[PDB]
Symmetry: C6
Subunit: 91 residues, 6 copies
Protein backbone atom coordinates (compact mmCIF):
# COMPACT_ATOMS: atom_id res chain seq x y z
CA UNK A 1 0.00 0.00 0.00
CA UNK A 2 1.60 3.22 -1.26
CA UNK A 3 0.17 6.74 -1.31
CA UNK A 4 0.70 6.92 -5.08
CA UNK A 5 -1.77 4.06 -5.67
CA UNK A 6 -4.75 5.90 -4.11
CA UNK A 7 -7.11 7.06 -6.88
CA UNK A 8 -10.73 8.18 -6.72
CA UNK A 9 -13.09 5.69 -8.31
CA UNK A 10 -15.40 6.90 -11.08
CA UNK A 11 -18.47 6.87 -8.79
CA UNK A 12 -16.78 7.23 -5.39
CA UNK A 13 -17.84 10.27 -3.33
CA UNK A 14 -15.11 12.85 -2.83
CA UNK A 15 -15.57 12.59 0.95
CA UNK A 16 -14.88 8.85 0.87
CA UNK A 17 -11.80 9.35 -1.32
CA UNK A 18 -10.27 12.16 0.78
CA UNK A 19 -10.45 9.80 3.77
CA UNK A 20 -8.54 6.98 2.06
CA UNK A 21 -5.86 9.46 0.95
CA UNK A 22 -5.28 10.60 4.53
CA UNK A 23 -5.73 7.10 5.97
CA UNK A 24 -2.91 5.94 3.68
CA UNK A 25 -0.70 9.02 4.16
CA UNK A 26 -0.57 8.29 7.91
CA UNK A 27 1.42 5.08 7.30
CA UNK A 28 3.87 6.00 4.51
CA UNK A 29 7.20 6.52 6.28
CA UNK A 30 8.26 10.05 5.29
CA UNK A 31 8.91 13.52 6.67
CA UNK A 32 6.11 15.91 7.62
CA UNK A 33 7.28 18.36 4.96
CA UNK A 34 7.07 15.62 2.32
CA UNK A 35 3.61 14.48 3.46
CA UNK A 36 2.34 18.06 3.18
CA UNK A 37 3.82 18.24 -0.32
CA UNK A 38 2.15 14.92 -1.13
CA UNK A 39 -1.17 16.37 0.06
CA UNK A 40 -0.59 19.39 -2.20
CA UNK A 41 -0.03 17.49 -5.48
CA UNK A 42 -1.57 14.01 -5.36
CA UNK A 43 -4.96 14.77 -3.79
CA UNK A 44 -6.34 16.92 -6.61
CA UNK A 45 -4.35 15.06 -9.28
CA UNK A 46 -5.66 11.59 -8.42
CA UNK A 47 -9.29 12.78 -8.38
CA UNK A 48 -11.85 11.67 -10.94
CA UNK A 49 -12.70 13.92 -13.91
CA UNK A 50 -15.96 15.08 -12.30
CA UNK A 51 -14.39 16.37 -9.09
CA UNK A 52 -11.27 17.52 -10.96
CA UNK A 53 -13.18 19.92 -13.23
CA UNK A 54 -14.77 21.47 -10.13
CA UNK A 55 -11.58 21.69 -8.05
CA UNK A 56 -9.77 23.44 -10.90
CA UNK A 57 -12.50 26.07 -11.16
CA UNK A 58 -11.69 27.03 -7.56
CA UNK A 59 -7.98 27.51 -8.19
CA UNK A 60 -5.19 27.76 -5.63
CA UNK A 61 -5.62 28.71 -1.99
CA UNK A 62 -8.66 26.48 -1.46
CA UNK A 63 -8.71 24.39 1.71
CA UNK A 64 -10.32 20.99 2.25
CA UNK A 65 -13.50 22.51 3.72
CA UNK A 66 -13.76 24.57 0.51
CA UNK A 67 -13.30 21.64 -1.88
CA UNK A 68 -15.33 19.18 0.19
CA UNK A 69 -18.27 21.60 -0.10
CA UNK A 70 -17.84 22.11 -3.86
CA UNK A 71 -17.89 18.36 -4.62
CA UNK A 72 -20.67 16.96 -2.44
CA UNK A 73 -23.07 17.62 -5.33
CA UNK A 74 -21.29 15.34 -7.80
CA UNK A 75 -23.59 12.39 -8.39
CA UNK A 76 -26.74 14.08 -7.11
CA UNK A 77 -29.96 14.67 -9.04
CA UNK A 78 -28.89 18.26 -9.71
CA UNK A 79 -25.48 17.36 -11.16
CA UNK A 80 -26.41 14.43 -13.41
CA UNK A 81 -29.14 16.57 -14.97
CA UNK A 82 -27.06 19.74 -15.18
CA UNK A 83 -24.31 17.86 -17.02
CA UNK A 84 -26.67 15.64 -19.03
CA UNK A 85 -28.79 18.61 -20.13
CA UNK A 86 -25.56 20.25 -21.36
CA UNK A 87 -24.10 17.46 -23.52
CA UNK A 88 -27.46 17.57 -25.31
CA UNK A 89 -26.92 21.26 -26.07
CA UNK A 90 -23.18 20.94 -26.72
CA UNK A 91 -24.04 18.41 -29.45
CA UNK B 1 -14.73 11.97 14.83
CA UNK B 2 -15.77 15.63 15.05
CA UNK B 3 -19.16 17.19 14.41
CA UNK B 4 -17.61 19.43 11.74
CA UNK B 5 -16.68 16.38 9.63
CA UNK B 6 -20.27 15.12 9.25
CA UNK B 7 -21.38 16.02 5.72
CA UNK B 8 -24.32 14.80 3.65
CA UNK B 9 -23.28 12.45 0.87
CA UNK B 10 -24.27 13.37 -2.68
CA UNK B 11 -26.64 10.37 -2.86
CA UNK B 12 -27.36 9.95 0.86
CA UNK B 13 -30.97 10.52 1.99
CA UNK B 14 -31.58 13.46 4.29
CA UNK B 15 -33.07 11.17 6.94
CA UNK B 16 -29.78 9.27 7.17
CA UNK B 17 -27.64 12.42 7.24
CA UNK B 18 -29.72 13.88 10.07
CA UNK B 19 -29.21 10.65 12.02
CA UNK B 20 -25.41 10.77 11.76
CA UNK B 21 -25.38 14.49 12.58
CA UNK B 22 -27.36 13.90 15.77
CA UNK B 23 -25.65 10.54 16.35
CA UNK B 24 -22.33 12.42 16.28
CA UNK B 25 -23.61 15.49 18.16
CA UNK B 26 -24.66 13.53 21.28
CA UNK B 27 -21.04 12.42 21.99
CA UNK B 28 -19.27 15.79 21.55
CA UNK B 29 -17.51 17.38 24.51
CA UNK B 30 -19.69 20.49 24.04
CA UNK B 31 -22.19 22.34 26.19
CA UNK B 32 -25.94 22.05 25.67
CA UNK B 33 -26.04 25.71 24.62
CA UNK B 34 -23.34 25.12 22.00
CA UNK B 35 -24.97 21.94 20.68
CA UNK B 36 -28.16 23.86 19.93
CA UNK B 37 -26.15 26.54 18.10
CA UNK B 38 -24.32 23.79 16.21
CA UNK B 39 -27.65 22.27 15.17
CA UNK B 40 -28.85 25.56 13.68
CA UNK B 41 -25.64 26.38 11.79
CA UNK B 42 -23.90 23.15 10.73
CA UNK B 43 -26.95 21.02 9.87
CA UNK B 44 -28.09 23.07 6.87
CA UNK B 45 -24.63 24.18 5.68
CA UNK B 46 -23.30 20.61 5.42
CA UNK B 47 -26.22 19.32 3.34
CA UNK B 48 -25.59 18.54 -0.32
CA UNK B 49 -26.71 21.06 -2.96
CA UNK B 50 -29.97 19.19 -3.66
CA UNK B 51 -31.38 19.33 -0.13
CA UNK B 52 -29.88 22.78 0.47
CA UNK B 53 -31.77 24.47 -2.37
CA UNK B 54 -35.00 23.03 -0.95
CA UNK B 55 -34.19 23.97 2.64
CA UNK B 56 -33.06 27.48 1.68
CA UNK B 57 -36.51 27.94 0.11
CA UNK B 58 -38.38 27.30 3.37
CA UNK B 59 -36.55 29.97 5.37
CA UNK B 60 -36.06 30.43 9.10
CA UNK B 61 -38.35 28.96 11.73
CA UNK B 62 -38.64 25.52 10.11
CA UNK B 63 -38.42 22.51 12.41
CA UNK B 64 -36.97 19.12 11.56
CA UNK B 65 -40.54 17.94 10.94
CA UNK B 66 -40.87 20.56 8.19
CA UNK B 67 -37.40 20.08 6.67
CA UNK B 68 -37.37 16.28 6.52
CA UNK B 69 -40.85 16.05 4.98
CA UNK B 70 -39.66 18.47 2.27
CA UNK B 71 -36.49 16.52 1.39
CA UNK B 72 -37.63 12.88 1.49
CA UNK B 73 -38.51 13.17 -2.20
CA UNK B 74 -34.97 14.17 -3.16
CA UNK B 75 -33.53 11.30 -5.16
CA UNK B 76 -36.99 9.83 -5.74
CA UNK B 77 -38.66 9.24 -9.11
CA UNK B 78 -40.70 12.44 -9.00
CA UNK B 79 -37.93 14.75 -7.81
CA UNK B 80 -35.32 13.33 -10.20
CA UNK B 81 -37.61 13.68 -13.21
CA UNK B 82 -38.75 17.22 -12.37
CA UNK B 83 -35.15 18.43 -12.12
CA UNK B 84 -34.26 16.91 -15.48
CA UNK B 85 -37.24 18.62 -17.13
CA UNK B 86 -36.27 22.07 -15.82
CA UNK B 87 -32.73 21.36 -17.07
CA UNK B 88 -33.90 21.06 -20.68
CA UNK B 89 -36.10 24.15 -20.31
CA UNK B 90 -33.35 26.39 -18.91
CA UNK B 91 -30.94 25.47 -21.75
CA UNK B 92 -33.09 23.90 -24.48
CA UNK C 1 -36.69 3.90 17.85
CA UNK C 2 -39.85 5.97 18.19
CA UNK C 3 -42.87 5.46 15.93
CA UNK C 4 -42.80 9.10 14.80
CA UNK C 5 -39.17 8.64 13.70
CA UNK C 6 -40.09 6.05 11.05
CA UNK C 7 -40.18 7.66 7.60
CA UNK C 8 -40.08 6.30 4.07
CA UNK C 9 -36.79 6.75 2.26
CA UNK C 10 -36.90 8.32 -1.20
CA UNK C 11 -35.93 5.09 -2.99
CA UNK C 12 -37.27 2.67 -0.37
CA UNK C 13 -40.16 0.46 -1.55
CA UNK C 14 -43.51 0.82 0.16
CA UNK C 15 -43.60 -2.84 1.23
CA UNK C 16 -40.33 -2.38 3.13
CA UNK C 17 -41.37 0.90 4.77
CA UNK C 18 -44.64 -0.60 6.06
CA UNK C 19 -42.66 -3.53 7.47
CA UNK C 20 -40.48 -1.21 9.56
CA UNK C 21 -43.50 0.86 10.62
CA UNK C 22 -45.23 -2.21 12.03
CA UNK C 23 -41.97 -3.68 13.34
CA UNK C 24 -41.45 -0.49 15.37
CA UNK C 25 -45.14 0.00 16.22
CA UNK C 26 -45.29 -3.45 17.84
CA UNK C 27 -42.52 -2.36 20.23
CA UNK C 28 -44.14 0.92 21.29
CA UNK C 29 -45.41 1.25 24.86
CA UNK C 30 -49.00 2.45 24.44
CA UNK C 31 -52.59 1.24 24.26
CA UNK C 32 -54.19 -0.61 21.37
CA UNK C 33 -56.66 2.19 20.61
CA UNK C 34 -53.73 4.60 20.21
CA UNK C 35 -51.75 2.22 17.99
CA UNK C 36 -54.66 1.89 15.56
CA UNK C 37 -55.00 5.68 15.47
CA UNK C 38 -51.28 5.93 14.72
CA UNK C 39 -51.61 3.67 11.67
CA UNK C 40 -54.55 5.67 10.34
CA UNK C 41 -52.65 8.99 10.54
CA UNK C 42 -48.89 8.39 10.47
CA UNK C 43 -48.65 5.56 7.93
CA UNK C 44 -49.74 7.70 4.95
CA UNK C 45 -48.25 10.96 6.29
CA UNK C 46 -44.62 9.79 6.63
CA UNK C 47 -44.67 8.32 3.10
CA UNK C 48 -42.57 9.79 0.32
CA UNK C 49 -44.23 12.18 -2.17
CA UNK C 50 -44.52 9.48 -4.86
CA UNK C 51 -46.42 6.88 -2.82
CA UNK C 52 -48.32 9.75 -1.17
CA UNK C 53 -49.66 11.19 -4.43
CA UNK C 54 -50.86 7.70 -5.38
CA UNK C 55 -52.41 7.15 -1.93
CA UNK C 56 -54.40 10.41 -1.89
CA UNK C 57 -56.18 9.12 -5.02
CA UNK C 58 -57.51 5.98 -3.32
CA UNK C 59 -59.05 8.26 -0.70
CA UNK C 60 -60.44 7.07 2.63
CA UNK C 61 -61.57 3.51 3.19
CA UNK C 62 -58.61 2.00 1.34
CA UNK C 63 -57.12 -0.98 3.17
CA UNK C 64 -53.54 -2.06 3.82
CA UNK C 65 -53.97 -4.43 0.85
CA UNK C 66 -55.29 -1.83 -1.61
CA UNK C 67 -52.51 0.64 -0.78
CA UNK C 68 -49.68 -1.86 -1.21
CA UNK C 69 -51.16 -3.00 -4.53
CA UNK C 70 -51.28 0.66 -5.62
CA UNK C 71 -47.64 1.44 -4.72
CA UNK C 72 -45.57 -1.60 -5.75
CA UNK C 73 -45.13 0.08 -9.14
CA UNK C 74 -43.42 3.13 -7.65
CA UNK C 75 -39.76 2.93 -8.62
CA UNK C 76 -40.35 0.55 -11.52
CA UNK C 77 -39.71 0.91 -15.25
CA UNK C 78 -43.35 1.63 -16.11
CA UNK C 79 -43.59 4.21 -13.34
CA UNK C 80 -40.34 6.06 -14.06
CA UNK C 81 -41.15 6.39 -17.76
CA UNK C 82 -44.65 7.66 -16.91
CA UNK C 83 -43.31 10.20 -14.41
CA UNK C 84 -40.63 11.43 -16.82
CA UNK C 85 -42.90 11.88 -19.85
CA UNK C 86 -45.46 13.91 -17.90
CA UNK C 87 -42.74 16.33 -16.77
CA UNK C 88 -41.07 16.79 -20.16
CA UNK C 89 -44.37 17.61 -21.89
CA UNK C 90 -44.98 20.27 -19.20
CA UNK C 91 -42.04 22.48 -20.26
CA UNK D 1 -44.83 -15.40 7.73
CA UNK D 2 -47.87 -16.14 5.55
CA UNK D 3 -48.13 -16.84 1.83
CA UNK D 4 -50.51 -13.88 1.42
CA UNK D 5 -47.80 -11.36 2.41
CA UNK D 6 -45.29 -12.31 -0.31
CA UNK D 7 -45.25 -9.50 -2.88
CA UNK D 8 -42.82 -8.67 -5.66
CA UNK D 9 -40.75 -5.56 -5.03
CA UNK D 10 -40.86 -2.78 -7.63
CA UNK D 11 -37.29 -3.55 -8.76
CA UNK D 12 -37.01 -7.20 -7.67
CA UNK D 13 -36.25 -9.64 -10.53
CA UNK D 14 -39.07 -12.07 -11.32
CA UNK D 15 -36.84 -15.09 -10.66
CA UNK D 16 -36.11 -13.90 -7.11
CA UNK D 17 -39.83 -13.35 -6.37
CA UNK D 18 -40.88 -16.82 -7.51
CA UNK D 19 -38.13 -18.24 -5.30
CA UNK D 20 -39.53 -16.66 -2.13
CA UNK D 21 -43.13 -17.54 -3.03
CA UNK D 22 -42.31 -21.24 -3.22
CA UNK D 23 -39.90 -20.99 -0.29
CA UNK D 24 -42.88 -19.60 1.64
CA UNK D 25 -45.48 -21.88 0.05
CA UNK D 26 -43.68 -25.06 1.14
CA UNK D 27 -44.00 -23.83 4.75
CA UNK D 28 -47.64 -22.72 4.85
CA UNK D 29 -49.91 -25.14 6.72
CA UNK D 30 -52.35 -26.55 4.15
CA UNK D 31 -52.95 -29.54 1.89
CA UNK D 32 -51.42 -29.95 -1.56
CA UNK D 33 -54.72 -29.16 -3.28
CA UNK D 34 -54.98 -25.83 -1.45
CA UNK D 35 -51.35 -25.04 -2.29
CA UNK D 36 -51.90 -25.67 -6.01
CA UNK D 37 -54.84 -23.24 -5.95
CA UNK D 38 -52.67 -20.67 -4.15
CA UNK D 39 -50.04 -20.90 -6.90
CA UNK D 40 -52.50 -20.18 -9.73
CA UNK D 41 -54.11 -17.18 -8.00
CA UNK D 42 -51.51 -15.61 -5.70
CA UNK D 43 -48.31 -15.95 -7.74
CA UNK D 44 -49.51 -13.78 -10.63
CA UNK D 45 -51.65 -11.48 -8.47
CA UNK D 46 -48.78 -10.40 -6.20
CA UNK D 47 -46.46 -9.54 -9.10
CA UNK D 48 -45.46 -5.94 -9.74
CA UNK D 49 -47.13 -3.98 -12.56
CA UNK D 50 -44.30 -4.62 -15.05
CA UNK D 51 -44.10 -8.41 -14.55
CA UNK D 52 -47.92 -8.43 -14.70
CA UNK D 53 -48.85 -6.71 -17.98
CA UNK D 54 -46.56 -9.20 -19.75
CA UNK D 55 -48.17 -12.22 -18.08
CA UNK D 56 -51.68 -10.92 -18.74
CA UNK D 57 -50.74 -11.09 -22.45
CA UNK D 58 -49.79 -14.77 -22.53
CA UNK D 59 -53.17 -15.81 -21.14
CA UNK D 60 -54.00 -19.06 -19.39
CA UNK D 61 -52.09 -22.29 -19.89
CA UNK D 62 -48.57 -20.86 -19.87
CA UNK D 63 -46.45 -22.76 -17.36
CA UNK D 64 -43.80 -21.23 -15.10
CA UNK D 65 -40.81 -21.74 -17.41
CA UNK D 66 -43.02 -20.12 -20.06
CA UNK D 67 -43.59 -17.02 -17.91
CA UNK D 68 -40.12 -16.69 -16.37
CA UNK D 69 -38.63 -16.55 -19.86
CA UNK D 70 -41.11 -13.78 -20.70
CA UNK D 71 -40.30 -11.73 -17.58
CA UNK D 72 -36.51 -12.03 -17.38
CA UNK D 73 -36.20 -8.93 -19.58
CA UNK D 74 -37.88 -6.58 -17.12
CA UNK D 75 -35.25 -4.25 -15.68
CA UNK D 76 -32.66 -5.18 -18.29
CA UNK D 77 -31.01 -2.35 -20.25
CA UNK D 78 -33.22 -3.06 -23.28
CA UNK D 79 -36.51 -3.10 -21.41
CA UNK D 80 -36.34 0.43 -19.97
CA UNK D 81 -35.48 1.83 -23.40
CA UNK D 82 -38.65 0.26 -24.83
CA UNK D 83 -41.00 1.39 -22.04
CA UNK D 84 -39.52 4.90 -22.05
CA UNK D 85 -40.03 5.28 -25.81
CA UNK D 86 -43.77 4.57 -25.79
CA UNK D 87 -44.35 6.92 -22.85
CA UNK D 88 -42.96 9.83 -24.89
CA UNK D 89 -45.03 8.98 -27.98
CA UNK D 90 -48.13 8.89 -25.73
CA UNK D 91 -47.84 12.57 -24.71
CA UNK E 1 -30.68 -27.00 -7.47
CA UNK E 2 -30.96 -28.38 -11.02
CA UNK E 3 -29.27 -27.01 -14.16
CA UNK E 4 -32.66 -26.27 -15.73
CA UNK E 5 -33.34 -23.59 -13.08
CA UNK E 6 -30.20 -21.51 -13.75
CA UNK E 7 -31.24 -18.34 -15.59
CA UNK E 8 -29.49 -15.05 -16.29
CA UNK E 9 -30.87 -12.18 -14.24
CA UNK E 10 -32.12 -9.09 -16.07
CA UNK E 11 -29.20 -7.00 -14.76
CA UNK E 12 -26.69 -9.82 -14.20
CA UNK E 13 -23.47 -9.85 -16.27
CA UNK E 14 -22.99 -12.71 -18.71
CA UNK E 15 -19.64 -13.50 -17.06
CA UNK E 16 -21.32 -13.95 -13.68
CA UNK E 17 -24.08 -16.10 -15.20
CA UNK E 18 -21.79 -18.51 -17.06
CA UNK E 19 -20.04 -19.28 -13.76
CA UNK E 20 -23.19 -20.35 -11.92
CA UNK E 21 -24.20 -22.35 -15.00
CA UNK E 22 -20.90 -24.25 -15.04
CA UNK E 23 -20.69 -24.34 -11.24
CA UNK E 24 -24.14 -25.94 -11.31
CA UNK E 25 -23.43 -28.17 -14.32
CA UNK E 26 -20.46 -29.68 -12.47
CA UNK E 27 -22.96 -30.65 -9.75
CA UNK E 28 -25.81 -31.94 -11.92
CA UNK E 29 -25.92 -35.74 -11.86
CA UNK E 30 -25.72 -36.72 -15.53
CA UNK E 31 -23.29 -38.20 -18.05
CA UNK E 32 -20.46 -36.15 -19.53
CA UNK E 33 -22.15 -36.49 -22.93
CA UNK E 34 -25.51 -35.16 -21.71
CA UNK E 35 -23.61 -32.27 -20.09
CA UNK E 36 -22.11 -31.10 -23.38
CA UNK E 37 -25.60 -31.25 -24.90
CA UNK E 38 -26.83 -29.19 -21.95
CA UNK E 39 -24.18 -26.52 -22.51
CA UNK E 40 -24.94 -26.35 -26.24
CA UNK E 41 -28.69 -25.74 -25.74
CA UNK E 42 -29.51 -24.36 -22.28
CA UNK E 43 -26.65 -21.88 -21.89
CA UNK E 44 -28.01 -19.68 -24.69
CA UNK E 45 -31.75 -20.22 -24.14
CA UNK E 46 -31.59 -19.21 -20.46
CA UNK E 47 -29.83 -15.92 -21.20
CA UNK E 48 -31.66 -12.61 -20.86
CA UNK E 49 -33.01 -10.89 -23.99
CA UNK E 50 -30.22 -8.30 -24.22
CA UNK E 51 -27.46 -10.91 -24.36
CA UNK E 52 -29.65 -13.26 -26.41
CA UNK E 53 -30.03 -10.63 -29.13
CA UNK E 54 -26.24 -10.37 -29.42
CA UNK E 55 -25.67 -14.14 -29.37
CA UNK E 56 -28.30 -14.98 -31.99
CA UNK E 57 -26.52 -12.57 -34.36
CA UNK E 58 -23.19 -14.41 -34.21
CA UNK E 59 -24.67 -17.80 -35.09
CA UNK E 60 -23.37 -21.34 -34.64
CA UNK E 61 -19.74 -22.25 -34.11
CA UNK E 62 -19.02 -19.42 -31.65
CA UNK E 63 -16.95 -20.39 -28.62
CA UNK E 64 -17.33 -19.12 -25.07
CA UNK E 65 -14.33 -16.86 -25.70
CA UNK E 66 -16.30 -15.30 -28.57
CA UNK E 67 -19.65 -15.05 -26.76
CA UNK E 68 -18.29 -13.72 -23.46
CA UNK E 69 -16.30 -11.05 -25.32
CA UNK E 70 -19.47 -10.05 -27.20
CA UNK E 71 -21.65 -9.65 -24.07
CA UNK E 72 -19.34 -7.90 -21.59
CA UNK E 73 -20.63 -4.61 -23.02
CA UNK E 74 -24.26 -5.29 -22.14
CA UNK E 75 -25.19 -3.03 -19.25
CA UNK E 76 -22.48 -0.45 -19.91
CA UNK E 77 -22.69 3.25 -20.76
CA UNK E 78 -22.02 2.74 -24.47
CA UNK E 79 -24.41 -0.21 -24.72
CA UNK E 80 -27.27 1.35 -22.76
CA UNK E 81 -27.10 4.54 -24.83
CA UNK E 82 -26.90 2.54 -28.06
CA UNK E 83 -30.15 0.69 -27.28
CA UNK E 84 -32.04 3.75 -26.03
CA UNK E 85 -31.25 5.44 -29.36
CA UNK E 86 -32.49 2.86 -31.87
CA UNK E 87 -35.71 2.62 -29.85
CA UNK E 88 -36.26 6.39 -29.71
CA UNK E 89 -35.46 6.80 -33.40
CA UNK E 90 -37.46 3.68 -34.32
CA UNK E 91 -40.50 5.02 -32.46
CA UNK E 92 -41.14 8.64 -31.44
CA UNK F 1 -7.51 -22.67 -9.78
CA UNK F 2 -7.79 -19.35 -11.63
CA UNK F 3 -5.99 -18.83 -14.95
CA UNK F 4 -4.81 -15.33 -15.87
CA UNK F 5 -6.69 -15.80 -19.15
CA UNK F 6 -10.08 -15.84 -17.35
CA UNK F 7 -9.66 -12.44 -15.66
CA UNK F 8 -12.04 -10.19 -17.61
CA UNK F 9 -13.42 -6.75 -16.79
CA UNK F 10 -17.07 -6.70 -15.82
CA UNK F 11 -19.38 -4.54 -17.94
CA UNK F 12 -19.82 -2.15 -14.99
CA UNK F 13 -16.51 -2.49 -13.11
CA UNK F 14 -13.98 0.32 -12.56
CA UNK F 15 -10.73 -0.03 -14.47
CA UNK F 16 -8.79 0.45 -11.23
CA UNK F 17 -10.57 -2.55 -9.71
CA UNK F 18 -10.11 -4.79 -12.75
CA UNK F 19 -6.41 -3.89 -12.97
CA UNK F 20 -5.90 -4.94 -9.34
CA UNK F 21 -7.48 -8.35 -9.96
CA UNK F 22 -5.29 -8.82 -13.04
CA UNK F 23 -2.10 -8.17 -11.08
CA UNK F 24 -3.35 -10.02 -8.00
CA UNK F 25 -3.91 -13.00 -10.31
CA UNK F 26 -0.74 -12.59 -12.38
CA UNK F 27 1.43 -12.60 -9.24
CA UNK F 28 0.28 -16.19 -8.66
CA UNK F 29 0.50 -17.59 -12.20
CA UNK F 30 3.29 -20.17 -12.40
CA UNK F 31 4.74 -18.59 -15.57
CA UNK F 32 8.14 -16.90 -15.82
CA UNK F 33 8.73 -13.18 -15.36
CA UNK F 34 9.45 -12.81 -19.08
CA UNK F 35 6.10 -14.44 -19.88
CA UNK F 36 4.31 -12.24 -17.33
CA UNK F 37 5.50 -8.99 -18.93
CA UNK F 38 4.21 -10.26 -22.27
CA UNK F 39 0.94 -11.15 -20.53
CA UNK F 40 0.64 -7.61 -19.15
CA UNK F 41 1.01 -6.04 -22.60
CA UNK F 42 -1.54 -8.26 -24.39
CA UNK F 43 -4.19 -9.53 -21.96
CA UNK F 44 -4.69 -6.41 -19.82
CA UNK F 45 -5.58 -4.20 -22.80
CA UNK F 46 -7.47 -7.03 -24.55
CA UNK F 47 -9.62 -8.30 -21.66
CA UNK F 48 -11.06 -4.85 -20.94
CA UNK F 49 -14.71 -4.02 -21.51
CA UNK F 50 -15.80 -2.05 -24.59
CA UNK F 51 -16.14 1.22 -22.66
CA UNK F 52 -12.50 1.28 -21.54
CA UNK F 53 -11.10 -0.47 -24.63
CA UNK F 54 -12.12 2.28 -27.07
CA UNK F 55 -10.18 4.82 -24.99
CA UNK F 56 -7.07 2.68 -24.47
CA UNK F 57 -7.16 1.99 -28.20
CA UNK F 58 -6.79 5.78 -28.61
CA UNK F 59 -3.85 6.31 -26.24
CA UNK F 60 -1.84 4.06 -28.54
CA UNK F 61 1.39 2.22 -27.78
CA UNK F 62 3.93 3.39 -25.24
CA UNK F 63 1.24 4.19 -22.66
CA UNK F 64 2.24 3.43 -19.07
CA UNK F 65 -0.15 2.25 -16.37
CA UNK F 66 -0.24 5.68 -14.73
CA UNK F 67 -1.45 6.99 -18.11
CA UNK F 68 -4.14 4.39 -18.84
CA UNK F 69 -5.72 4.36 -15.37
CA UNK F 70 -5.93 8.16 -15.37
CA UNK F 71 -7.76 7.94 -18.73
CA UNK F 72 -10.33 5.39 -17.51
CA UNK F 73 -11.32 6.60 -14.02
CA UNK F 74 -13.99 8.78 -15.65
CA UNK F 75 -15.76 5.89 -17.37
CA UNK F 76 -19.11 5.26 -15.74
CA UNK F 77 -19.26 8.76 -14.26
CA UNK F 78 -21.83 11.49 -14.88
CA UNK F 79 -19.68 13.40 -17.37
CA UNK F 80 -18.88 10.20 -19.25
CA UNK F 81 -22.43 8.84 -19.57
CA UNK F 82 -23.88 12.22 -20.58
CA UNK F 83 -21.15 12.46 -23.22
CA UNK F 84 -21.62 8.89 -24.49
CA UNK F 85 -25.42 9.19 -24.39
CA UNK F 86 -25.33 12.53 -26.22
CA UNK F 87 -23.51 11.06 -29.23
CA UNK F 88 -25.76 8.00 -29.49
CA UNK F 89 -28.83 10.13 -30.21
CA UNK F 90 -26.65 12.32 -32.46
CA UNK F 91 -25.35 9.33 -34.45
CA UNK F 92 -28.97 8.27 -35.11
Amino acid sequence: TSILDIRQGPKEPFRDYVDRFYKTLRAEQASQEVKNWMTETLLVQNANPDCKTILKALGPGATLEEMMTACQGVGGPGHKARVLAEAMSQV
